[PDB]
């Protein structure tokens, strides 16, 4: 690599995130804040994604 090289020859840093979805208990989650649980009621639910 050289700083005067073209855009195709410039460095590019690549991070590849690999993950499995909804097949195992989860140790990492998103920004959504959890609310209180409601039992025996027709309600939209988001359990562990």
């Amino acid at each position: 690599f050289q700083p005067t090289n073209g855009v195709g020859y410039q460095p590019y840093r690549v991070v590849v995130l690999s993950f499995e979805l909804l097949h195992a208990p989860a140790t990492v989650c998103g920004p959504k804040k959890s609310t209180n649980l409601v039992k025996n009621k027709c309600v939209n639910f988001n359990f562990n994604g």
């Binding site: 195709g8 410039q10 590019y12 840093r13 590849v16």
Partner: protein, 49 residues
Amino acid sequence: DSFVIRGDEVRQIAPGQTGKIADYNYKLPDDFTGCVIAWNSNNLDSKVG
């Protein structure tokens, strides 16, 4: 999975592609369930000379 490549080889990261990075260096699985994040780093990795 973190690494550094050239600008032309970024498209070689995607699954189903062929190249010097895809065949001999790093191969995404066909059913990859994940993300690829690539950013330019000419100011950091590249140096004069």
